[PDB]
Amino acid sequence: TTCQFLTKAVLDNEREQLDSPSARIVVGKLNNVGTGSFDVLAKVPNA
Amino acid sequence: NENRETARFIKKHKKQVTNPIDEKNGTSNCIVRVPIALYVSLAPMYLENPLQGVMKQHLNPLVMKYNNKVGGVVLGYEGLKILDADPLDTSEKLIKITPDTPFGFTWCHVNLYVWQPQVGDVLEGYIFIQSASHIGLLIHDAFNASIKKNNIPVDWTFVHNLGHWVDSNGEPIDGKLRFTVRNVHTTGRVVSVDGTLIS
Amino acid sequence: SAAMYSRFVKSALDDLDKNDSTQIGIIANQVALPSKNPERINDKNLNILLDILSSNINRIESSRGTFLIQSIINFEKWWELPPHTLSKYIYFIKILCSSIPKWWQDVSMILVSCFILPIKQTVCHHDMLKYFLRMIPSSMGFIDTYLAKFFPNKNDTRRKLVNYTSNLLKLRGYCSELGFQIWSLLIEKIISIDVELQNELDELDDDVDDDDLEEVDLMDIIEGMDGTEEYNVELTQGIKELSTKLDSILTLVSTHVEEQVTPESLESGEGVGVFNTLTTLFKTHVLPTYYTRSIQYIMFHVSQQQLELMDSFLVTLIDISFAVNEAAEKKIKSLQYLGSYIARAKKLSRTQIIFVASYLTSWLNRYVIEREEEVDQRGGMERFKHFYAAFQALCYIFCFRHNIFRDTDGNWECELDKFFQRMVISKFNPLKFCNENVMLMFARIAQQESVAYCFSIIENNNNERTRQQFIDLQSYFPYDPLFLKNYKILMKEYYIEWS
Amino acid sequence: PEDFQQHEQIRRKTLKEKAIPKDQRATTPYMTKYERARILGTRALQISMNAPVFVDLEGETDPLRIAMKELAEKKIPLVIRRYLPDGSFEDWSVEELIVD
Amino acid sequence: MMKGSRRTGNNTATTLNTPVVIHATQLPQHVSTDEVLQFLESFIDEKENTNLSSSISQLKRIQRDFKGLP
Amino acid sequence: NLSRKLVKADSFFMDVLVVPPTRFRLPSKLGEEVHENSQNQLLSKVLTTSLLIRDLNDDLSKLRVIFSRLMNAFVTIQNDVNAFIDSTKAQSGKVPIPGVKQALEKKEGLFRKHMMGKRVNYAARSVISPDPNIETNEIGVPPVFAVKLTYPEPVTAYNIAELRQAVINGPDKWPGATQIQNEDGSLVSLIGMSVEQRKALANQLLTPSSNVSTHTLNKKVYRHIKNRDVVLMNRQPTLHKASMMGHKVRVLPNEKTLRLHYANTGAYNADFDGDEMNMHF
Amino acid sequence: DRLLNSSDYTQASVCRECGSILTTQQSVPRIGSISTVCCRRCSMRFEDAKKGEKIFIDDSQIWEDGQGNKFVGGNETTTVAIPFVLKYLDSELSAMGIRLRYNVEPK
Amino acid sequence: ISKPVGSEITSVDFGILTAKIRNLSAKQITNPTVLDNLGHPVSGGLYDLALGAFLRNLCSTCGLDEKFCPGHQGHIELPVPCYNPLFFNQLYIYL
Amino acid sequence: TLKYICAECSSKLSLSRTDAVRCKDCGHRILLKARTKRLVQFEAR
Amino acid sequence: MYKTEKVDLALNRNRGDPITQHFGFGNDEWPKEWLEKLDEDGLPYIGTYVEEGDPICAYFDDTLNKTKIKTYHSSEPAYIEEVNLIGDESNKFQELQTVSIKYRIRRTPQIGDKF
Amino acid sequence: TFIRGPICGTDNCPSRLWRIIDGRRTCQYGHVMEGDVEFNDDEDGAGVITRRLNLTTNATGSFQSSQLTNSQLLQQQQRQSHKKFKKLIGHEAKLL
């Protein structure tokens, strides 16, 4: 019932926070269940 | 009801600092230091000397070119400072790797010495050549000016043999000329300065 | 006629204020006809159109004024005009782009694209080009994008290829601030033709005399043809072109760099800048090229002219080959390059020969304590590939330069007749693990110089005997004899034969 | 103008109220099976783009097998940021985590 | 097509070339002529102790402009 | 509400449509027979009716029957935009024209067929075959599959010895390559070449290009699938996560089928009588 | 990898002011310039030059299209990596009178 | 992997297109003809060349070709405001 | 001389342009193509 | 494995429509290298080995002034077994427009066949 | 194999084009241009849409083939021209 929920999302004027995995695959964002559940940061020596 | 929208456009284009006419030379001031914040990409080959990596990838392509966000010609830079992603200062900072690529993005502060002239400014550059259509000038030995024929007083002629330009008082004009700055152009990668001698 | 067409072009010029722009699409069309269509404008009316447009500039600054300045740019064969129109055409562009500093985006699109043509064909092209370097300082940037883009195709004739690099070695001496973007554009675009040659090297090129062929030699075909034009393959690539392209181009590199090195420019000029812009281009470009002859002769041709240019490169070549902060397969290749540069170079000093070998035997005698009982531990003989590569370079010197190390008495410098006595019977056995052929001839010469007696240990490999990229670097001698038929004539003074 | 500086100041102060300090973090001291696959993923993805390697690679051509050797000797210069589900985070380095 | 790829090869302003965003964080604050030559002498000495060669020689014209004569 | 914009009534009413770009409205085709699009068919009926209700408004502008066709034209200008968005909420021969709403709601449509269920490059499928002479964590790749599937391997100082040999072998001999990527982004296919060009191009891999925009990037040789790569291997009803496991690659000559150990037949729940498995690389 | 990096994966352009994908455009450059990417509903046509004593435009905010116009503004666009179906989805919801505003946080 | 992405989409707002679509696309479509005889895209039709390049013609909006143009939108000026069948069930409450 | 074969009466029969595609002895329509002397090659496998 | 394929050129017409496309080759042009698979009547030699892509019959339509071929498009190579020539039924003067070719795919017991 | 199209980039190859493994067109010297993606559709009745056909999408890509009456200009006049013996022989018949 896709456009049932679509009209509901517009009449609510909803912001999609993009954190369910079915919403990250739609917008192409990386899923965060497993290896996407953290961030890797590189340590650089110079100030 | 026609003011809450039109106000959003005037302050978008109103320049922050106007150029002042300084030390009573007539010449206005156009060299200005501005602090900026960047969002750049450090690369894996420069992961041992990160300051040299940002300087060689993002800062050196920017010098001596017109930049949109500062409204001027970026002369040089001073004081690069990478923002740490760890709000603990220190040398061993750390930046964030993108998930897909090995590239790391970060924030940086640096002071840009930019050259920002506006309209209504007065500059003194040396005349490169002169003809019976224009006067061409090297502003500060690096920039270019073009005083067109409608922007020259009518009582100033041109003697020909090429040749010197003739003013009203019969003086063949010398290189170091004062001129009023008209609409500064953007169009080519060569960034020129239109001018007037009329007032 | 001359007074008739002078107001014919002012009526069209006054059509900006009349606001219809009548003959701008006609008068400037007339100057846009090609040379092969003789219905174009003559030069007398071209003086008429020019001096109207050189003396009034206010009335072209519009999008209707675009097409006429386009036509002066696209004026084909402007460099073949008579001097009362040529020297007036030159003065147009010098005040066109002065009045509007926008068209220089598009003028040197035409000026750099005519560097294909020869030197005396385009002596006026550099007169306008150098002018706008001292005129427009912020044009050094995008000129470099015009040199790389209008560098010719690799499979062109040499006429587009020996006259482009000639016009581009022309560009260096007038602007050394450009400098590094010239040689990087040459050296990488020489390897494009260079390494397409040695993988052919099976049989010789016949010296056919028809090398320098001809003098100066001097239709729309625009249809809807984008269907199938199948099976017109004829896949053939020439070979004797490619030995003569490197004859043509790389002689002119070494003939003009012969102008660029002489001590009048090495002491008060920019000749050391030539020497530094190639050695820093040596270790970046040509040293990671696998199996490439005939391009390391340029650094060989230059670093032999003075005693300084030699000695300011031997210390550079060794710092590549013995610093820990490099890659190992660079370090082995520079040792591979060092023994072949010393022994295959004619005009050197004899005290330059010994200091390489004195430092090299020092490195083996600074090896003498630290790493000479590591062999018996659990590992391989591949842990010592830097040591074997350095000893192999030592053997390659003595197989060529041996009589230098004989002193006046008849003895050997720095105990070379005692040094190999220790190295052979050491617990590395460098007779087996170095190259076979450089060690085969070293055993013969050690008998004919009475230095070592290492026949029976090369004999002592009967039942006794990753590695493939280490055997192969022992087979790449950098100063193998040149195949190029016409560049060796210059190299005959510099490069030593077999005997 | 200053309206950027009013926003950068907020963004970094909000990012200061999420950084849990090194004395107060309360997650596990183990490398939890997914760091190890992503550390060796990302470090090998750097070594293939000419990163400086801090191990004596001995004829190993595989970039992933090199990172598995930089991990065993604690030579990987990376930092894991463990997100707690309100947004706040703990920065654990790779040297102090314990690999399985 | 070809000249579609020339215009991709014309600019080539990507995220290794150019930064993502640039914001001016304060008001631009002018300096005297006495601090321009104080700056251009140290900045040229830093970058000459590759590319940037087409840029520094324009600064040396600018450096010579505040005290000398073409 | 942080913009404090007003909830207005013209949110409910459509003063204009928008038309999708031409790329999204290309003509349909069957064989040589290139028909007209579904989307243009509905969108023209609105545009004829809009011109009518404009032309007939000029007819009533000079003063009955003309008031009864204008009011009937409001029924059908509403009914044809109702047809443009929905299909069941319009009238239809037997099965009417699909609207943009009904292009979205089933197993097919858009939101499950092309957003959760995309089709992928670098994949292969074949019948599987038993093998006790491979490792249990392995799949036996045929040489038919092996000379097609390629992996971009960036050329560096530690792999130029094995990537020169890949460009020399070319896309016929197995431990080879198919195309190399320059530092500018363009590719160079090695298919039609001979050993002259390929050996003269393997020797240029570590050469820096003169550009400064791409002085960071290096080249990428698209080597074939060697014995050290891995593979996602996929029995087709994936009822649990052990039906999609990661095998190592062992390239076997002289075979036409994927070839799998017996220890993996309980995990995928496979019986070796014609099961196809997807090989994702 | 098996749902973006192999299937479609476009690097599209996105305006950082209206937050929309399909309102972007690379300009037709005037003959000296290089073409750049500029939004459309964040843009204002050059006829709207209505009233620092004067409010003249910096000429770097002025871009053209091939149909003739000059627009002011429309800058602040970026490049994000999306699937292509999101570009097609956002062109089907526009036909329904529905807009999708994308929040792109590095600003 | 050698083309990194910086900015990235973090959250998605839903919304309604106001009738100021005339800002982003005034290339409006009035002719219900799709193609003429002799196969050309007619001006002001549903295959106009300002809506993106088509049949090897250039885009009148991009200046780019058949492949490189992203496509562009176009509006159809309804002379009267007929309502939307999506939001109709939820204005019939409010009426 | 290329020919054909009538499928019914088995008469060998060449056929030219502007001819009814028929046999000329019986009136049969189905008219199969004969094979001529022409080299094909095989592995003996 | 045998397999037939009806090659019909009268699919595109009505009964009141005159003839457009004709079997056999065209002149005033060079259709290259199609004569190794095909005979001078536009039909294949029988016994001929055809792969995917290979021409299977030549026709000449008058509405293009051009000789196009039809193509054997199948994953499995075959041999032309039979070529039949279907005559007309209605009138006694029009050209042949229906040809049914028979292919022969050899099928040795490869690995994966079920016994 | 080769399909002649435009000239090619790189300042190297001026030649025709040629498609590569299933998806993209290259020159014969190795160089390949961007955006070359072949746009082939799927196959699934399928809506009551069977009319208004003018194109035939030849040349391995998008569209623009079969222009209407681009060779019919001699076609309706070659029924009355190709065949002989029209019995219009009036004064030549007395010579015949």
Swiss-Prot record, chain B:
It is found in: Nucleus, Nucleolus. The modification Phosphoserine is found at residues 192, 199. GO terms for biological process: nucleolar large rRNA transcription by RNA polymerase I; ribosome biogenesis; termination of RNA polymerase I transcription; transcription by RNA polymerase I; transcription elongation by RNA polymerase I; transcription initiation at RNA polymerase I promoter. Contains an average of four phosphates per molecule. GO terms for molecular function: DNA-directed RNA polymerase activity. Keywords: DNA-directed RNA polymerase, Nucleus, Phosphoprotein, Ribosome biogenesis, Transcription. The keyword Transport does not apply. One of its GO terms (cellular component) is nucleus. The keyword Ligase does not apply. Disulfide bonds: none annotated. Its main location: nucleus. DNA-dependent RNA polymerases catalyze the transcription of DNA into RNA using the four ribonucleoside triphosphates as substrates. Component of RNA polymerase I (Pol I) which synthesizes ribosomal RNA precursors. Besides, RNA polymerase I has intrinsic RNA cleavage activity. Through its association with RRN3 is involved in recruitment of Pol I to rDNA promoters. In vitro, the A13-A43 subcomplex binds single-stranded RNA. Present with 4070 molecules/cell in log phase SD medium. Belongs to the eukaryotic RPA43 RNA polymerase subunit family. This is DNA-directed RNA polymerase I subunit RPA43. It comes from Saccharomyces cerevisiae (strain ATCC 204508 / S288c). The lineage of its organism: Eukaryota, Fungi, Dikarya, Ascomycota, Saccharomycotina. The gene is RPA43. The chain holds residues 8 to 251 of 326 of the full protein.
From Swiss-Prot, chain D:
It is found in: Cytoplasm; Nucleus. Keywords: Cytoplasm, DNA-directed RNA polymerase, Nucleus, Phosphoprotein, Ribosome biogenesis, Transcription. GO terms for cellular component: cytoplasm; nucleoplasm; nucleus; RNA polymerase I complex; RNA polymerase II, core complex; RNA polymerase III complex. One of its GO terms (molecular function) is DNA-directed RNA polymerase activity. The keyword Transcription applies. GO terms for biological process: nucleolar large rRNA transcription by RNA polymerase I; ribosome biogenesis; RNA-templated transcription; termination of RNA polymerase I transcription; termination of RNA polymerase III transcription; transcription by RNA polymerase I; transcription by RNA polymerase II; transcription by RNA polymerase III. Belongs to the archaeal Rpo6/eukaryotic RPB6 RNA polymerase subunit family. DNA-dependent RNA polymerases catalyze the transcription of DNA into RNA using the four ribonucleoside triphosphates as substrates. Common component of RNA polymerases I, II and III which synthesize ribosomal RNA precursors, mRNA precursors and many functional non-coding RNAs, and small RNAs, such as 5S rRNA and tRNAs, respectively. Pol II is the central component of the basal RNA polymerase II transcription machinery. RNA polymerases are composed of mobile elements that move relative to each other. Present with 6090 molecules/cell in log phase SD medium. The gene is RPO26. The chain holds residues 55 to 154 of 155 of the full protein.
Curated annotation (Swiss-Prot), chain J:
It is found in: Nucleus, Nucleolus. Disulfide bonds: none annotated. Three distinct zinc-containing RNA polymerases are found in eukaryotic nuclei: polymerase I for the ribosomal RNA precursor, polymerase II for the mRNA precursor, and polymerase III for 5S and tRNA genes. Present with 14100 molecules/cell in log phase SD medium. Component of the RNA polymerase I (Pol I) complex consisting of 14 subunits: RPA135, RPA190, RPC40, RPA14, RPB5, RPO26, RPA43, RPB8, RPA12, RPB10, RPC19, RPC10, RPA49 and RPA34. The complex is composed of a horseshoe-shaped core containing ten subunits (RPA135, RPA190, RPB5, RPO26, RPB8, RPB10, RPC10, RPA12, RPC19 and RPC40) where RPA135 and RPA190 form the DNA-binding cleft. Outside of the core, RPA14 and RPA43 form the stalk that mediates interactions with transcription initiation factors and newly synthesized RNA. Belongs to the RNA polymerase beta chain family. This is DNA-directed RNA polymerase I subunit RPA135. It comes from Saccharomyces cerevisiae (strain ATCC 204508 / S288c). The gene is RPA135.
From Swiss-Prot, chain K:
Belongs to the RRN7/TAF1B family. Component of RNA polymerase I core factor complex (CF) that acts as a SUA7/TFIIB-like factor and plays a key role in multiple steps during transcription initiation such as pre-initiation complex (PIC) assembly and postpolymerase recruitment events in polymerase I (Pol I) transcription. Binds rDNA promoters and plays a role in Pol I recruitment. After binding of UAF (upstream activation factor) to an upstream element of the promoter, CF is recruited in a SPT15/TBP-dependent manner to form a pre-initiation complex. It comes from the Eukaryota. It comes from Saccharomyces cerevisiae (strain ATCC 204508 / S288c). Residues 35-59 are annotated as: B-reader. It is found in: Nucleus, Nucleolus. Present with 398 molecules/cell in log phase SD medium. Zn(2+) binds at residues 8, 13, 27, 31. A zinc finger (RRN7-type) spans 1-34. Transmembrane segments: none annotated. This is RNA polymerase I-specific transcription initiation factor RRN7. Residues 60-94 are annotated as: B-linker. Although it shares weak sequence similarity with SUA7/TFIIB, displays a similar subdomain organization as SUA7/TFIIB, with a N-terminal zinc finger, a connecting region (composed of B-reader and B-linker regions), followed by 2 cyclin folds.
